Every structure is written in C-alpha cells, then in structure tokens.
Curated annotation (Swiss-Prot), chain A:
Membership in a protein family: Belongs to the eukaryotic ribosomal protein eL31 family.
Record-linked CDD domains: Ribosomal_L31e (cd00463)
GO terms of molecular function: structural constituent of ribosome
HAMAP family in UniProt: Ribosomal_eL31
Name assigned to this protein: Large ribosomal subunit protein eL31
InterPro entries noted in UniProt: Ribosomal_eL31, Ribosomal_eL31_CS, Ribosomal_eL31_dom_sf
UniProt source species: Pyrobaculum calidifontis (strain DSM 21063 / JCM 11548 / VA1)
UniProtKB/Swiss-Prot annotation, chain E:
The name this protein goes by in its record: Large ribosomal subunit protein eL39
Biological process (GO), any one: translation
InterPro entries with a match to the protein in the record: Ribosomal_eL39, Ribosomal_eL39_CS, Ribosomal_eL39_dom_sf
Pfam families from the UniProt entry: Ribosomal_L39
UniProtKB keywords: Ribonucleoprotein, Ribosomal protein
HAMAP family (alphabetical): Ribosomal_eL39
Entry annotated with the keyword Cytoplasm: no
SUPFAM superfamilies: Ribosomal protein L39e
GO CC, any one term: ribonucleoprotein complex
Similarity field: Belongs to the eukaryotic ribosomal protein eL39 family.
Amino acid sequence: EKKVVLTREYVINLRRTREVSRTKRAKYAVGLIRRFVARHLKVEPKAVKLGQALNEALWARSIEKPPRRVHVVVEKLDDGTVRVELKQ
Amino acid sequence: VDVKRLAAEILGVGVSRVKISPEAVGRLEEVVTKDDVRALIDEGLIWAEPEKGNSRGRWRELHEKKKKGRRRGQGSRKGRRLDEEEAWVNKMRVMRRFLNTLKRQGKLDPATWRQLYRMVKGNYFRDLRHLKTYINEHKLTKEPVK
Amino acid sequence: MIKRFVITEKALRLAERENKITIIVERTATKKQIADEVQRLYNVKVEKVNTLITPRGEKKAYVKLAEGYSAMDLLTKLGVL
Amino acid sequence: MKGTPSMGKHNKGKTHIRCPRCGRHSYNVTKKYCASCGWGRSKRWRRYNWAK
Amino acid sequence: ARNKPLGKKLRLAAALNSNRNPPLWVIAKTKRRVTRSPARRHWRRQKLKA
RNA sequence: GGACGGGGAACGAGCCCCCGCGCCCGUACCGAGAACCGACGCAGGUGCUCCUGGGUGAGAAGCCCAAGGCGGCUCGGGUGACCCCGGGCCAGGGAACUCGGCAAAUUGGCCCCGUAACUUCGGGAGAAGGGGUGCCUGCGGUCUUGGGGUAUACCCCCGGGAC
RNA sequence: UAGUAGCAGCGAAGAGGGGUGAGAAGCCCCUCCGCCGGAAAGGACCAGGGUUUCCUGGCAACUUCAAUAGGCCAGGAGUUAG
RNA sequence: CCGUGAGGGAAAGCUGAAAAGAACCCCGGAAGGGGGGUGAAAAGAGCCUGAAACCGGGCGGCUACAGUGGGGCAGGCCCGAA
RNA sequence: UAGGCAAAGCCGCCCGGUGGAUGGCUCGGCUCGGGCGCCGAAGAAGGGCGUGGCAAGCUGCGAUAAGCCCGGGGUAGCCGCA
Ligand SMILES: [Mg+2]
Ligand SMILES: [Mg+2]
Ligand SMILES: [Mg+2]
Ligand SMILES: [Mg+2]
Ligand SMILES: [Mg+2]
Ligand SMILES: [Mg+2]
Ligand SMILES: [Mg+2]
Ligand SMILES: [Mg+2]
Ligand SMILES: [Mg+2]
Ligand SMILES: [Mg+2]
Ligand SMILES: [Mg+2]
Ligand SMILES: [Mg+2]
Ligand SMILES: [Mg+2]
Ligand SMILES: [Mg+2]
Ligand SMILES: [Mg+2]
Ligand SMILES: [Mg+2]
Ligand SMILES: [Mg+2]
Ligand SMILES: [Mg+2]
Ligand SMILES: [Mg+2]
Ligand SMILES: [Mg+2]
Ligand SMILES: [Mg+2]
Ligand SMILES: [Mg+2]
Ligand SMILES: [Mg+2]
Ligand SMILES: [Mg+2]
Ligand SMILES: [Mg+2]
Ligand SMILES: [Mg+2]
Ligand SMILES: [Mg+2]
Ligand SMILES: [Zn+2]
C-alpha cells in the first residue's frame, strides 16, 4: 500500500570487504550497503530495508566470500523509508 | 508455550524440521493444548519439512565404474583389502567338495583321492582349474572332468 | 484419614474422563484402608486405588469408582466443586 | 592433582548420613555409628568434657 | 537421585515447604520489620546436607 | 527341577474352562563447557558410564553429510600503526645458530624388488636402498550368493556381491 | 589507581524480513549462512543435586554486555505399577 | 552459614504524641520527579541525632617562564554580624 | 607592563550526596547475695516431621496439633512475637 516516490539503480562496489577480517565479510557487506544507500538517498542507515534476494546474494558463498559488487534497485517510499533489492 | 515442542511430538518429527507459518503469528499466543496445535496442523499453518536423505546418484554412478575395473589402482589402496585367511577357507572348500564328490560318485579311487586331498592341503594347486588340468593330464579319472 | 479433595485441572479431567476422585490422605494410609474409607463414607464401590507421595510429603490417591457410580456426581454431592 | 581436580570426585559418595537419634549429618554408614552422639555403638549419649 | 529412600524424601519435602519468604501481609503487619526468612535458600547455592 | 523312599485319604490333577487376591517405598527434571564437586552460570574433575546412519578409508582415524540438535564453550562495532599470541611463504647458502639442531623442516599409506655388522639364532628388520601409484576405454581371472537347466560338486544360462 | 585491566586464545557465526513491546542486533516466526554427527554437541541413564520440571505473569536484584529472555522472581500445578 | 566429620559460627537495635503512613493535579515504561498536603518538627517508612574519610556543585584566592611542604617578616585580593 | 581573562590542576569555607561516627535511649548482658533442687519403661531429656483462613522463621502445641475439659482468680474484651 506504500507508494514509491523515487527509483534508482546503483552498482555498489564491495571491494572494501576484501580489506577487513575474513571472519566477518558477509556481515560487513550488509553494513556497506546500508551506508551507501543512506548516503545516496539522504536517509539514516536504519531506514534502509534490504530485500531477501539481496541478503541471499551476499551470503551465497558463506561469511567469507561476499560478491565483489552488487547491482541493486533502490526505491524510496512516500513515508521516507528506502527499499534496496537485488536487480534481477 | 513453545508451540514447536508440541508440534514436533504431534507430527512425530524433530523440532529441527517443524515449520510454523508466519501468517499464524497472531494465533501462537493463544495455543494452550496439544489439540490447539492439532487445529493449526489441520489448517496447514504448521507442517513438517521433509527430511534430507543423502543422495546416492553420484555413488551409484561410481559403483558401476568400480565394477568395470576403475578407480582401484595402486594409488587408491591404503590398507589390506584381501583377507588371506578367508581365501584359504574358500580354496579348501572349493577343492575338497569337488574331490569328495568325485570319490562319492566312484570316479576317483580312495588311494588317488587321498593323494590329491593331501596335495590340495599342501598348497600344490593354485585353483580349481589347475586341479582339473592335473586330473585330466594324469588320467586320474576314467573320463575327463569338465 | 481423608484430609481434602484435589480439584485441580488434572484432577477434574480424571473425574470426567476416567471416573476417578483424587484425595489427600494421611501419609501412612494404605490402598486397602483408602478403599475401605471411601466406600464407608460415600457408599460407592471402588474399582482400584493408585497412590503416590507428592514432593511436599503428602499422600495422594487416585481412586477409580466402579461402573455404577459417578465421580463427578459424588464431588457435586459433597459440595467440594 | 590433589586440589581442584580431586575435588571433582567428592560429587557422588558419602561417609555420613543423618543420624536418627541426634539429627546431625554424622552417622558413619560404614562404621554403623554416629560420630556426634554415638548412636549405634553407645546407648549413652556421646559428649566429652574437652568440648565446650 | 532417581531411587530415593522415603526418609530422605521427607526431609527434602520439609526443606521445600519451608523455602519461601514471609507473605506480603506479614511485611505490612510488622511495619516492614519482617521481610526475610532464614529458611529461604536457593537450590544452587545453599546446599542441604540431606 | 528331578529322582528315590516312607505315611495317609477316596478321590482327583502339570491338561481345558471359570472365579478371586496381589501390601509397602521409588517414579518430576538435570544427569553436566550453566541443574553434581571444585567459594562461580569455573576450559578442571565426575561419566564418554552405555549406544550411534551414509561417502571415502585398514579403521569406532581424519574429512564431508544425515537422523537429531546447536549458533549460550553467553560482549557488540570500527580501524587495519607498532608490539604480542597462534599460523603461511621466503632467493643464495645449509647448523656458519646454540650449552645442545631447542624449535622447525625432512620422511610418511599401500604394492613390488631388496636389506648389513652383530646375535642370547628368537632377533637385528619397516634395517638401509631402488621402483610403482590419477583418470578413461576395453578384455580377463579367483571366489561368493540365489534362481533356472537331468542337475545337490563340476559344466551352461540369468540376477546380485567381494577381491 | 581508573571509566583503566579483563569480558580474545582451548578449530561454530552470524544475516534479512516480519511480530511483540515504552524501548529490540540479541525475545517469537520464516528465509539465508554456518557447527556437531562413534559427539566439549545426538540417544539413554547411575550417584549426587532437590523442584532446578510444567503453566501464567514479571524485570528491583541475579546472568562478565543487552533483554520484553531465563536454571532468576511471584502465583499456580505436576511424579499413579502384582 | 562453614567443614566428610570430630567440630566451628556471624552480621543485624531507635518514624512520630498520634499514621495524622503523604489525599488530589501534571510528567514518566517504571523505580520515581514536580506541584500540593500531614505534623511542633519530614522525623517519609532506605524513618532520632547524622561526624570524618570520600565525591559533586557554588563561592574566595592561585593558575600555562618557573621546582612544590612548614615558620617569620612585608604586601595583594577576599571575609571580618555575634 | 600589569587588568578585562578563563586550560588541566591546588588550597579553604558553604551546600548536597555517600557513610554511619557521636550523643541520648535500653524489655539485653555481667557480677554478687538469697532460695530451691532431681527427671525416666505410667516410655524421659534430645531430635525429626507436622500444626494457623491468608503463615516462611521464632514461640507454643501433637492428627483433639498458637490448642480440648474441670475448678479457682479475672470482667469485657479476645484470636502469641506481629
Ligand atoms: Mg581418488
Ligand atoms: Mg596366517
Ligand atoms: Mg507407587
Ligand atoms: Mg593431601
Ligand atoms: Mg567409604
Ligand atoms: Mg554446586
Ligand atoms: Mg522420567
Ligand atoms: Mg560458562
Ligand atoms: Mg537435521
Ligand atoms: Mg572486540
Ligand atoms: Mg630459503
Ligand atoms: Mg657451531
Ligand atoms: Mg657461535
Ligand atoms: Mg625437535
Ligand atoms: Mg583490553
Ligand atoms: Mg570441524
Ligand atoms: Mg555469540
Ligand atoms: Mg561439518
Ligand atoms: Mg569418526
Ligand atoms: Mg550426551
Ligand atoms: Mg523451565
Ligand atoms: Mg515461563
Ligand atoms: Mg525460584
Ligand atoms: Mg536521620
Ligand atoms: Mg565583629
Ligand atoms: Mg580550570
Ligand atoms: Mg520432645
Ligand atoms: Zn547421632
């Protein structure tokens, strides 16, 4: 029922995951995406909602090997929340 | 209450395989009895996920290859596979029951039977085929043994 | 010898479904004495008596009445329900 | 080994139980008498003058 | 233990019956002078020598 | 339980049908990297005491995965200096290190060939030393387990298993 | 001393979405990811412990952090034999 | 309560004459806070008095080119009602 | 040149928080003097368990269980500490 006011596509580069401890990389990538979306959509990082396909993509190779980049679609809602989903 | 604990008992599966639909979150707080859980199972709001059986497709393909002689070379053996003591038991029974039948049928005289019996016990013969050839070569029977 | 009746959720379920009354008796009462006491006091017939001693040290008897007497009716008559 | 690891073996056995006469945790079950009141070996109550 | 003697079980029953604080109306009746019970204990900390 | 004896009654069973009685105490739960002992919701001890599917494999080894359970050996995030603890690699040299090859490294399974002095004749011995090892396509052998062929072994045909 | 040491080391770990709630990384549900699987982990059970079991409610204290959770607290219940 | 046991073993007194034990309003998730009450006095149930160490705030003096505490003399700032 | 003018820090007083000293109180102790002096198979002392409407401990009591009967004292209140 929530209306969409803005739609954008981004390629988020996740190469920073290769510079942090191997034991946390997939979780770290979730934080990278929230900070990216909050920066490019001017919202707080807790206002960013990740889609299931995006979460599954980040974890597809377990905690150590998230992908190097993700192509996502970002939707801003009429109430100020933001949805991020894998482009597919 | 813990609905998964009750559902697992009713469904007869592990708690690790009981799935409760998120659409029934409103109704989970009202569960009191196992009959209440039986209502939710009947409505399809609680079910059991099918168990995993390890797939044997790869094994069955490999099993056929091994029957044709593959993947059993020198580099794939790490210990003893042939039971030598069991092989002796089979070798004695194969030879003795052949010789004892020939004597019971009158095709072998007891003197010749005893010599062959002791020669079988003495590891003279490699296998039943070798024993037959010796019998045929030395005319130890009136007619050749097949 | 009878101290009180047990009127819990489990006890009431056993009254309706299995024709049993649940009582607390003196800890030294035996199954023979419990059956005699129930028959004398309430004029019923006892089929069998199961007993246990609770973790609080009290003896509880599940007393099954014979098939002509109602455990639910007896509790109502006594006014303990 | 004599310290903490050996304390692990004091979890299951007993030397004494409760005495029926005096009620203390002092009845030596193997010796069959009470270390406090002497019940089981002495019909008189054990109490020494060196004890206050 | 699973296999208990009754005499020990009855001493355990007594400790279970006594392990509780004074009722709230006792606190009111004594103007908050009586709030604790010496028989109050926790099964993990204060061990019975039963 | 049986046998071998002694005594007694006129009835009467180890068989069939049928009737009656079976008191007292324990029974929850943990049973341990949080229910026991160690002052603790303690990497110890008690108890891994008894039981455990599939693949690989000599293996109740390790590794991977079921049944079943767990993410509670009860802090989270960011950064990616030094230094510390625990790991990986390092040209040329190869014990020059050091009390000392400490530590690390080398070797490593299985099959074949081969194996010295000495010796209490048993051993030494896996002495030492040399070689082989994957995958695929076919062709064989030795057995085993059923069934069908005159058919109890042999022989022929069909299905499965091991080497 | 000092808002300092420790809350690392003993070969598992979390993440997304939803619900509850004054308040949620942590409670409940699903999905994804992982660890054990002849076992610090699954099945049974002796001693010892003694109510820690189960239900409802709760969060002053207790849990090396948090908490709406809990072996904690309050109230109720539960152990049946030739 | 400690020790298997023989044995060993603490801490911990005080509202007020009278509960008159804090109505009622606002805020807080709650402990509670503000206002407003009772009493001669909050003495407020964590209850007579309420010291020092210790910590917070206010005030006086000093404070980043000058090595510390104590005494005497001289001076600056501040207090100096009884 | 000094003042406006100040960092962190120091000293002193006031107020507050913490703490529980001091002072007052005392149904407790201690010492001395006087009296009185055995209980138990008619089952003692001691212990365990139970016992209250809401009751955990102490005290009392014993399945007749903070109690039952008779008499005397005591008259209007009572249901121990509380
Ligand atoms: Mg291979
Ligand atoms: Mg041999
Ligand atoms: Mg029973
Ligand atoms: Mg010693
Ligand atoms: Mg002993
Ligand atoms: Mg313990
Ligand atoms: Mg059980
Ligand atoms: Mg722990
Ligand atoms: Mg599973
Ligand atoms: Mg950290
Ligand atoms: Mg090198
Ligand atoms: Mg040298
Ligand atoms: Mg040198
Ligand atoms: Mg070495
Ligand atoms: Mg640190
Ligand atoms: Mg592992
Ligand atoms: Mg964790
Ligand atoms: Mg694994
Ligand atoms: Mg294994
Ligand atoms: Mg286990
Ligand atoms: Mg529980
Ligand atoms: Mg609960
Ligand atoms: Mg509790
Ligand atoms: Mg005061
Ligand atoms: Mg003056
Ligand atoms: Mg300053
Ligand atoms: Mg007595
Ligand atoms: Zn004694």
